[PDB]
Swiss-Prot record:
UniProt function note: Photoactive blue light protein. Probably functions as a photoreceptor for a negative phototaxis response.
Molecular function in Gene Ontology: identical protein binding; photoreceptor activity
The entry's keywords: Chromophore, Photoreceptor protein, Receptor, Sensory transduction
Protein name: Photoactive yellow protein
UniProt PTM comment: The 4-hydroxycinnamic acid (p-coumaric acid) chromophore is covalently bound via a thioester linkage.
PTM-bearing positions, type S-(4-hydroxycinnamyl)cysteine: 67
Entry keyword annotation includes Transport: no
SUPFAM superfamilies, alphabetized: PYP-like sensor domain (PAS domain) (SSF55785)
Keyword Calcium on entry: no
InterPro entries (alphabetical): PAS (IPR000014), PAS-like_dom_sf (IPR035965), PAS_fold (IPR013767), PYP (IPR012130)
One annotated GO biological process: phototransduction
Name of the coding gene: pyp
Length: 123
């Protein structure tokens, strides 16, 4: 088990494969520094209606999730990528190619130093 917002969430998830990530209680997306989707779990697809198997490789901010292209989400992502001190939490509404859905979001640098987690749960 691992809870949304856990202080060491990035440690726990670093040890996980696809199946384990698919079993999480919350949506989990891993992005590279450019916002390309590296991983996308089953729980996230349950929130958004995206097929996880097919969004891999797409750009989260340009193509998949344009409603997050804003200072409030994408702006915070780029600030944290640039600082090396991505770890930030906030509320948001997802409303592109889905019923508007209120969520809470947590972004955090992965240990694969290279990538960046985006965590989502319904509120
Ligand atoms: C806004 O358009 C948000 C879209 C979105 C958020 C999260 C996802 O996993 C997929 C699309």
């Amino acid at each position: 088990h691992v809870a949304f917002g856990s202080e060491d969430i990035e440690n726990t998830l670093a040890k996980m494969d696809d199946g384990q990530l698919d079993g999480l209680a919350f949506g989990a997306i891993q992005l590279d520094g450019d916002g390309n989707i590296l991983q996308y779990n089953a729980a996230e697809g349950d929130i958004t209606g995206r097929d996880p198997k097919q969004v891999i490789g797409k750009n989260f901010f340009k193509d998949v999730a344009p409603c997050t292209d804003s200072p409030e989400f994408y702006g915070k992502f780029k600030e944290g990528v640039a600082s090396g001190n991505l770890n930030t939490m906030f509320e948001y509404t997802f409303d592109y190619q889905m019923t508007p859905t209120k969520v809470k979001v947590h972004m955090k640098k992965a240990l694969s130093g290279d990538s960046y987690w985006v965590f989502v749960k319904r509120v």
